[PDB]
């Protein structure tokens, strides 16, 4: 159980990092395409801006 | 009111001549070409 705790902590960290990179790539692509102000397009308002 | 039909009636023969002469052409224009676009460089800055 202790080993599973230790391993899955780092596994969750890696998954979170990959998810953040996934968000960042899409955000950058949209910003470059539509010439939106940098930093204005955040993760929280992604769906509203998409619509 | 002011009418534009008289002018069209006056220039109708010239309109027909142009239409005959414009078969191998592209009527209209595109609002993106410029005499400096071929030698320009685009910059992109992201401060944040």
Q: Round to whole Å and give the CA distance between A12 and A45.
A: 24
Q: CB distance B48–A38 less than 8 Å? A: yes
Q: Round to whole Å and give the CA distance between B47 and A4.
A: 42
Smallest CA–CA distance from A40 into chain B, residue:
B48
User: Entry resolution in angstroms?
Assistant: 3.3
Q: Round to whole Å and give the CA distance between A20 and A12.
A: 12
For A27, residues 6+ apart whose C-beta sits below 8 A from its C-beta are A41, A43, A46
The experimental method is cryo-EM
For A23, residues 6+ apart whose C-beta sits below 8 A from its C-beta are A43, A46
Q: CB distance A38–B44 less than 8 Å? A: no
């Amino acid at each position: 159980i202790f080993a599973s705790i230790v391993t899955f902590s780092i596994y969750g960290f890696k998954a979170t990092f990959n998810y953040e990179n996934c968000l960042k790539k899409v955000s950058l692509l949209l910003t470059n395409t539509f010439d939106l102000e940098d930093g204005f397009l955040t993760a929280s308002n992604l769906e509203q801006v998409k619509g | 009111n002011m009418n534009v039909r008289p002018l069209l009636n006056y220039f109708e023969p010239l309109f027909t001549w142009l239409k005959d002469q414009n078969k191998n052409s592209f009527v209209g224009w595109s609002t993106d070409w410029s005499p400096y676009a071929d030698q320009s460089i685009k910059v992109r800055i992201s401060l944040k």
